C-alpha cells in the first residue's frame, strides 16, 4: 500500500471585505484525487483547506511555497494537475513541510513590521485577534475551547498590513480552553528557504 497525496479541498476567501470558507471539492472527489495525485481544479488564494484520507487542516502560501505542518501532512506529496508533487521542504523538528505553490494561488509576503498585534485565520474563516507574546507564541484576546481551533494548523498569523507572521502549529490549552497559540515564525520559513 501507498499513502495518498494531500489534496486541496477548499480555501479561505480573504479577497473581499468578508472572510469566508469555500469548499471546492467533496469527499469522494478528494478520496480519488488523493489516490491518483491528479488534481485538475483551479487553485485560488493564499489560504487553502487541505485533506488526507484521515485528517483535515490548512495550508498557507508564502513566497511561492505552499506551507503546512508535518503532523498533518507527513512526508506526503501534494496532488496537482500533472500528478503528485514531491515536498521541496520537510522539517520534522519544526513541524514544517512545504511544496512549490500551485499555479493560481497567491502568496503572502513575509512580515517586516516588527509588530505584535496579530490575526489568526481559522479553517472556519474566523479572524481572531492575537497578541504576540514571544518568538513563537501569542495569546487570544478572547479565549476559545480547543474544538474551535482544531483543524486550523497550517493557517496563518497575519500582521495588520496583511503580511504573514507565521503558521499555526499547536494550541496552548488548559482543561480544554485555549488561551494561546503556538506558531512557526515566518523567519523560520525564510531560513528553511
**What is the tally of helices (H) and strands (E) in the chain?**
4, 13
Radius of gyration of the chain (CA): 16
Would you say 163 is a known binding-site residue?
Answer: yes
**Is 120 one of the binding residues for ligand SU3 (CB under 6 A)?**
no
Site string for Zn ion, 81-120 (x = CB under 5 A): ------------------------------x-x-------
Nearer to ligand SU3, 146 or 193 (CB): 146
- Does 151 contact ligand SU3 by CB under 6 A? yes
Place of cell 519544526: 94
Burial bucket for residue 32 (CB in 10 Å: 0-12, 13-18, 19+) = middle
Residue 161 interacting partner from ligand SU3, Zn ion, none (CB closer than 5 to 8 Å by kind): Zn ion
Q: Which is nearer to ligand SU3, 65 or 172 (CB)?
A: 172
Q: Which of 161, 177, 179, 190 binds Zn ion (CB under 5 A)?
A: 161
Residues sharing a CB contact under 8 Å with residue 22, sequence separation 6 or more, in sequence order = 10, 11, 12, 13
Amino acid at each position: 500500500k501507498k499513502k495518498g497525496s494531500v489534496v486541496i479541498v477548499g480555501r479561505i476567501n480573504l479577497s473581499g471585505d468578508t472572510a469566508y470558507a469555500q469548499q471546492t471539492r467533496g469527499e469522494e472527489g478528494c478520496q480519488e484525487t488523493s489516490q491518483t495525485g491528479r488534481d485538475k481544479n483551479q487553485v485560488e488564494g493564499e489560504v487553502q483547506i487541505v485533506s488526507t484520507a484521515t485528517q483535515t487542516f490548512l495550508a498557507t502560501s508564502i513566497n511561492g511555497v505552499l506551507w503546512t505542518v508535518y503532523h498533518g501532512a507527513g512526508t506526503r506529496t501534494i496532488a496537482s494537475p500533472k500528478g503528485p508533487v514531491t515536498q521541496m521542504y520537510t522539517n520534522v523538528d519544526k513541524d514544517l513541510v512545504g511544496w512549490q505553490a500551485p499555479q493560481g494561488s497567491r502568496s503572502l509576503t513575509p512580515c517586516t513590521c516588527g509588530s505584535s498585534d496579530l490575526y489568526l485565520v481559522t479553517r472556519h474563516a474566523d479572524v481572531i485577534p492575537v497578541r504576540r507574546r514571544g518568538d513563537s507564541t501569542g495569546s487570544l484576546l478572547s479565549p476559545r475551547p480547543l474544538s474551535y481551533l482544531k483543524g486550523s494548523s497550517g493557517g496563518p498569523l497575519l500582521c495588520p498590513a496583511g503580511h504573514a507572521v507565521g503558521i499555526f502549529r499547536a494550541a496552548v490549552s488548559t482543561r480544554g480552553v485555549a488561551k494561546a497559540v503556538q506558531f512557526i515564525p515566518v523567519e523560520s520559513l525564510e531560513t528553511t528557504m
